[PDB]
Ligand binder design. Sequence first.
Ligand SMILES: *[C@@H]1O[C@H](CO[C@@H]2O[C@@H](C)[C@@H](O)[C@@H](O)[C@@H]2O)[C@@H](O[C@@H]2O[C@H](CO)[C@@H](O[C@@H]3O[C@H](CO)[C@@H](O)[C@H](O[C@H]4O[C@H](CO)[C@@H](O)[C@H](O)[C@@H]4O)[C@@H]3O)[C@H](O)[C@H]2NC(C)=O)[C@H](O)[C@H]1NC(C)=O
Ligand SMILES: *[C@@H]1O[C@H](CO[C@@H]2O[C@@H](C)[C@@H](O)[C@@H](O)[C@@H]2O)[C@@H](O[C@@H]2O[C@H](CO)[C@@H](O[C@@H]3O[C@H](CO)[C@@H](O)[C@H](O)[C@@H]3O)[C@H](O)[C@H]2NC(C)=O)[C@H](O)[C@H]1NC(C)=O
Ligand SMILES: *[C@@H]1O[C@H](CO[C@@H]2O[C@@H](C)[C@@H](O)[C@@H](O)[C@@H]2O)[C@@H](O[C@@H]2O[C@H](CO)[C@@H](O[C@@H]3O[C@H](CO)[C@@H](O)[C@H](O)[C@@H]3O)[C@H](O)[C@H]2NC(C)=O)[C@H](O)[C@H]1NC(C)=O
Ligand SMILES: *[C@@H]1O[C@H](CO)[C@@H](O[C@@H]2O[C@H](CO)[C@@H](O)[C@H](O)[C@H]2NC(C)=O)[C@H](O)[C@H]1NC(C)=O
Ligand SMILES: *[C@@H]1O[C@H](CO)[C@@H](O)[C@H](O)[C@H]1NC(C)=O
Ligand SMILES: *[C@@H]1O[C@H](CO)[C@@H](O)[C@H](O)[C@H]1NC(C)=O
Ligand SMILES: *[C@@H]1O[C@H](CO)[C@@H](O)[C@H](O)[C@H]1NC(C)=O
Ligand SMILES: *[C@@H]1O[C@H](CO)[C@@H](O)[C@H](O)[C@H]1NC(C)=O
Ligand SMILES: *[C@@H]1O[C@H](CO)[C@@H](O)[C@H](O)[C@H]1NC(C)=O
Ligand SMILES: *[C@@H]1O[C@H](CO)[C@@H](O)[C@H](O)[C@H]1NC(C)=O
Ligand SMILES: *[C@@H]1O[C@H](CO)[C@@H](O)[C@H](O)[C@H]1NC(C)=O
Ligand SMILES: *[C@@H]1O[C@H](CO)[C@@H](O)[C@H](O)[C@H]1NC(C)=O
Ligand SMILES: *[C@@H]1O[C@H](CO)[C@@H](O)[C@H](O)[C@H]1NC(C)=O
Ligand SMILES: *[C@@H]1O[C@H](CO)[C@@H](O)[C@H](O)[C@H]1NC(C)=O
Ligand SMILES: *[C@@H]1O[C@H](CO)[C@@H](O)[C@H](O)[C@H]1NC(C)=O
Ligand SMILES: *[C@@H]1O[C@H](CO)[C@@H](O)[C@H](O)[C@H]1NC(C)=O
Lengths: 218, 196, 293, 286
Amino acid sequence: EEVLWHTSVPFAENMSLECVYPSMGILTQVEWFKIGTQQDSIAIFSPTHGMVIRKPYAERVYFLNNNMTLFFRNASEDDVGYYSCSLYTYPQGTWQKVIQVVQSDSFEAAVPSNSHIVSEPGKNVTLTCQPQMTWPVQAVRWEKIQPRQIDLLTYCNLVHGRNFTSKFPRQIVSNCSHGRWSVIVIPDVTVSDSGLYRCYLQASAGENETFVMRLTVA
Amino acid sequence: LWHTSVPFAENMSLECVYPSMGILTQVEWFKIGDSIAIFSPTHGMVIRKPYAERVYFLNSNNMTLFFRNASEDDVGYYSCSLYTYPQGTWQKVIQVVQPSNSHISEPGKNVTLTCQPQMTWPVQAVRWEKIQPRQIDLLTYCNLVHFTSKFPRQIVSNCSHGRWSVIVIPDVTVSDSGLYRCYLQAGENETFVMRL
Amino acid sequence: DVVVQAPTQVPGFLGDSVTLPCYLQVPNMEVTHVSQLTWARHGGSMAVFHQTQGPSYSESKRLEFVAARLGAELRNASLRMFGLRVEDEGNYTCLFVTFPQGSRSVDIWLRVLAKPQNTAEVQKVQLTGEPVPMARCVSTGGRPPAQITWHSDLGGMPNTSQVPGFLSGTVTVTSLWILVPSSQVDGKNVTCKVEHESFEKPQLLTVNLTVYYPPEVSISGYDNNWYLEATLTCDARSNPEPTGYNWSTTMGPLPPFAVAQGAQLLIRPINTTLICNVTNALGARQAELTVQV
Amino acid sequence: EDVVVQAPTQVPGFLGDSVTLPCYLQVPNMEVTHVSQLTWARHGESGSMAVFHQTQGPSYSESKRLEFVAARLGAELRNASLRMFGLRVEDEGNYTCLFVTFPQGSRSVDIWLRVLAKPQNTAEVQKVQLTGEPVPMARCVSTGGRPPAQITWHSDLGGMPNTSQVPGFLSGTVTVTSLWILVPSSQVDGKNVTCKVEHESFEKPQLLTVNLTVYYPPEVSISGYNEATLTCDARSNPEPTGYNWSTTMGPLPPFAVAQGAQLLIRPTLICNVTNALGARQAELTV
Ligand SMILES: *[C@@H]1O[C@H](CO[C@@H]2O[C@@H](C)[C@@H](O)[C@@H](O)[C@@H]2O)[C@@H](O[C@@H]2O[C@H](CO)[C@@H](O[C@@H]3O[C@H](CO)[C@@H](O)[C@H](O[C@H]4O[C@H](CO)[C@@H](O)[C@H](O)[C@@H]4O)[C@@H]3O)[C@H](O)[C@H]2NC(C)=O)[C@H](O)[C@H]1NC(C)=O
Ligand SMILES: *[C@@H]1O[C@H](CO[C@@H]2O[C@@H](C)[C@@H](O)[C@@H](O)[C@@H]2O)[C@@H](O[C@@H]2O[C@H](CO)[C@@H](O[C@@H]3O[C@H](CO)[C@@H](O)[C@H](O)[C@@H]3O)[C@H](O)[C@H]2NC(C)=O)[C@H](O)[C@H]1NC(C)=O
Ligand SMILES: *[C@@H]1O[C@H](CO[C@@H]2O[C@@H](C)[C@@H](O)[C@@H](O)[C@@H]2O)[C@@H](O[C@@H]2O[C@H](CO)[C@@H](O[C@@H]3O[C@H](CO)[C@@H](O)[C@H](O)[C@@H]3O)[C@H](O)[C@H]2NC(C)=O)[C@H](O)[C@H]1NC(C)=O
Ligand SMILES: *[C@@H]1O[C@H](CO)[C@@H](O[C@@H]2O[C@H](CO)[C@@H](O)[C@H](O)[C@H]2NC(C)=O)[C@H](O)[C@H]1NC(C)=O
Ligand SMILES: *[C@@H]1O[C@H](CO)[C@@H](O)[C@H](O)[C@H]1NC(C)=O
Ligand SMILES: *[C@@H]1O[C@H](CO)[C@@H](O)[C@H](O)[C@H]1NC(C)=O
Ligand SMILES: *[C@@H]1O[C@H](CO)[C@@H](O)[C@H](O)[C@H]1NC(C)=O
Ligand SMILES: *[C@@H]1O[C@H](CO)[C@@H](O)[C@H](O)[C@H]1NC(C)=O
Ligand SMILES: *[C@@H]1O[C@H](CO)[C@@H](O)[C@H](O)[C@H]1NC(C)=O
Ligand SMILES: *[C@@H]1O[C@H](CO)[C@@H](O)[C@H](O)[C@H]1NC(C)=O
Ligand SMILES: *[C@@H]1O[C@H](CO)[C@@H](O)[C@H](O)[C@H]1NC(C)=O
Ligand SMILES: *[C@@H]1O[C@H](CO)[C@@H](O)[C@H](O)[C@H]1NC(C)=O
Ligand SMILES: *[C@@H]1O[C@H](CO)[C@@H](O)[C@H](O)[C@H]1NC(C)=O
Ligand SMILES: *[C@@H]1O[C@H](CO)[C@@H](O)[C@H](O)[C@H]1NC(C)=O
Ligand SMILES: *[C@@H]1O[C@H](CO)[C@@H](O)[C@H](O)[C@H]1NC(C)=O
Ligand SMILES: *[C@@H]1O[C@H](CO)[C@@H](O)[C@H](O)[C@H]1NC(C)=O
């Protein structure tokens, strides 16, 4: 099965993985770990016993100062993979932000637009994405492409429903239910909302569809 | 099958409001299966027997067929056909036969109606209807496997995948208030009514 | 009482033009007023003719009212459709807006046709011992698909199948005449009959079968009444035709009284078992005959 | 050291056209081999579609559709290239080229024949009037393509596309139609939208620019802020047919004199401008 990420960043030597967890419930533990078959814990934070960094990450990673940004000092080729920033609280249980680290050459930020939407601040921006050539569509996702990172805003799996909670610091009105998944709304739009908004559609054989919409706020 | 369903009554009226398009040629009222009435803007109105003593009209883009003392025999499908240049033929089919649930409102706003399905079964057909105690009018019809709205009010709806359950009503007036029924077809069927 | 008279089916051809006849029959006793003519597909109007405004078409330079004219009684709603397409095949409603008789309409089924091109060829086989295609009959780009039937006294079972033709809507019908190959069927012909609505007569295509088999040799000319000159003949058949004829005996070479003269053996005035070895591209086959003097 | 069959992995052929499937047997300089037969077969088919014997010559399943272009009697069989006349959609598949050699044995190679059709690209304007709901304003058609062509758009306006596939005039081909839906406005009138069509048969993607056309009522404006003169200018498509001056009460006061767009005031004004779409007014307190 596919690994769902919330943020995608390129590989770097002084690479930092941002994780700003909300102040909610009875805080139990905050931890970093590399997603894989083998147990690979990086750092574990206790609200009473402080921070503990496991080997062989003890000489590669560090922290500064609700923000758990994981900084790296000379990262190796092997550090390319999926990272998790998990927050354990009562009575919620688990909060997880998955960060994907990709190769410097494989990461693309300079992508061309298809439509340019101009909107006044405070209004609701409605973004639509309809299948053009391929049908039945299995998955639909919305992304905000920045020059140094890509953030997953929405994700809907229509063939077999999956768990997706956006860790984006902005409210996005969306519904994965049948007859509602094509339209996503950004309510009370700010000047900071300006950027590239890519839509990705996945089919059965593997044929994909991309629709990039550029937003500009006055 | 029909655009408006009206229950049987002694002094029942079959509403037919056609759009003011092109040049009017002839307006016709006939039972699907006898010809009731024919209107010509040049020749005039002609009502046929035995409907001559049963039906009447009140008078400009409206052709409602009224009944004096309708009998149980007058049960079936009625057609209100409009012949215009250069559009051609326009037709409104009506049928005569013998719950509040959700509630949702400022005037002149874009009111959105959503049909949330409870059943997991894949939806093949969706139809929206306006329910009144005297008549049930079909708003929009959508078939996701393989129609023109006869309703005088403008309703924006998309038939494409991922938008079929949403219908918007732009610039809502006082007359738009009432019951809005949604029907979903797979096999299995679901019904949802919304108050306005 | 007024009735619309029009044929039930109208056949047309791809890229060609066709007229859809439709006229209003009015009895000499009744008076009518036709104010409009309408043409529409099943189930948006295609062609409209008004009593004062004249004609109006949805398609440019494709539809035309062949008889309707302004200042003349609207009775013939006959419409000509130019450059027919497979998408045009369907049921069309011809309507007459009459007063005070009301609207009178009829339905005409427009059928789009395509003349198929027929070819037939042999399938060169060998003695496989299993049923294989021995003849081929093809009918390309036909709408509707053509009917292919085989006529033979040899037997066989056909395998007719169809694939879409060059133009979308046309069908290419391919029929293989399957039979277990034998020496007896070689050279003999099989006919293929192609039947289609566009043909003036069904097309007949003849195909001669080809079977590759080694020689089938037999010696004749011995009436079993030899007493102390007669000629023996080596009767052989093969495809391809024989390349050699060799006469010998089980003991070895031919005796001085037995003289070989091609495919024949002359006996001059004893017990010998003569052999005739006949060769072709497939191989050599022998036949033995016991002669007594 | 060993005999190898030189042939491409895939061969792109065009529908209606004739293609040659290249298949040659490379024999080392001093190596001696005896090729006695060439065979062509389809993956899944019951038998062979083309056979060439060193002394018996060729045998074809479809003798008027197939030909051995480089195989002849009285010559060493080294080139088994086969020409296919009048390409059909049913001819798309994997083919096997065989060389019966001695004492090395049979040598085979698989070639994937792909039947293509170069689509014809057309782009036209969808002229429309002012409406609240979004309607098509541009059309991009890629007629009869195999495989169906990919149509994308580039705009400086926020318009969503609708694409619909309908079969072309030839079987196996697809006419791809793409509409550019956007809510009309006076701003997009004259502004251009580019359509990009991508296909395997093209040298590079084809770009088609389309100028947008909107039919809108007048956008009335008055200039000129003791005698003075005011001019009435309005933007519409088609251009205004008539201009009229009046007041909130009714007819013009005794000091104001007007003729169409120009108004003279001597020591609240309304300007009614009309076109084919309708009439619009502009209130101005003086
Ligand atoms: C043009 O119109 C003809 C006639 O149809 C008639 O007009 C239509 C507009 C509509 O109002 C119809 O209701 C009306 O009959 C079309 O021909 C008809 O084709 C349908 C199939 O598409 C036939 O329907 C039946 O379907 C049954 C399964 O549900 C099936 O069992 C029937 O088969 C039996 O009957 C046929 C002979 O009719 C016989 O050959 C079979 O062996 C079997 O017993 C049948 O298929 C209608 O019967 C057809 N009617 C006629 C008169 O042929 C035509 O398809 C249409 N053309 C286009 C392109 O749309
Ligand atoms: C009766 O005839 C049909 C038609 O197929 C014929 O096959 C050859 C003999 C040709 O020379 C033609 O005359 C004609 O096309 C037979 O059905 C077909 O069987 C074949 C296998 O033999 C199937 O082929 C496959 O096709 C798919 C793609 O569609 C490929 O991916 C496969 O690799 C493989 O090639 C084919 O699907 C099937 N149907 C058609 C319409 O082609 C049928 O077997 C035959 N019956 C008898 C008893 O002889
Ligand atoms: C002609 O042949 C090609 C090539 O297919 C294959 O080529 C070899 C490498 C062997 O694997 C052969 O057994 C076989 O002929 C056909 O294309 C191929 O189609 C298949 C599906 O039928 C593809 O397989 C899968 O593809 C998915 C998606 O890419 C993968 O996730 C799977 O792991 C699996 O590989 C195959 O990739 C594809 N090949 C190419 C190069 O695209 C082709 O369909 C065939 N033509 C006809 C008409 O039969
Ligand atoms: C099938 O074989 C027969 C006999 O060989 C062919 O008939 C001869 O055809 C020629 C045509 O050039 C005529 O001039 C002769 O009169 C025919 N008869 C004879 C006895 O020679 C027939 O044409 C062959 N058919 C096919 C399609 O090959
Ligand atoms: C991080 O890396 C860049 C380039 O690799 C380097 O120039 C810069 O000094 C570094 N910044 C910090 C804050 O470490
Ligand atoms: C999290 O902390 C790092 C380091 O102090 C800082 O660069 C980053 O901006 C912080 N994130 C937020 C959202 O404050
Ligand atoms: C999966 O569910 C957990 C809560 O149980 C949530 O924290 C996490 O973000 C979800 N995964 C994704 C990819 O959103
Ligand atoms: C859309 O805008 C209105 C502005 O009044 C706001 O009330 C509404 O909540 C917005 N829609 C959504 C989905 O947030
Ligand atoms: C049509 O006319 C009748 C009689 O005047 C009236 O009751 C009905 O409401 C009219 N319809 C509309 C939509 O005005
Ligand atoms: C006019 O109608 C007659 C039948 O009454 C028909 O034979 C004739 O072909 C029609 N005219 C044309 C031009 O089709
Ligand atoms: C028949 O003739 C061929 C060719 O001359 C020869 O090779 C073969 O040995 C002969 N067969 C017999 C049994 O003599
Ligand atoms: C094989 O034949 C083809 C077609 O005649 C030709 O193009 C090709 O050059 C030949 N290959 C060799 C190596 O001779
Ligand atoms: C309401 O709908 C109309 C028509 O679609 C549109 O012009 C208007 O901008 C919409 N208003 C809002 C606030 O979305
Ligand atoms: C939208 O796309 C569908 C195909 O998915 C097509 O049939 C329909 O005509 C299109 N609608 C509009 C309004 O462009
Ligand atoms: C499209 O319009 C822009 C200005 O909005 C202009 O720079 C560009 O050259 C135009 N392109 C064409 C081909 O007219
Ligand atoms: C504007 O002019 C038109 C055409 O003469 C007229 O119908 C309309 O009533 C006028 N409006 C005003 C406010 O004078």
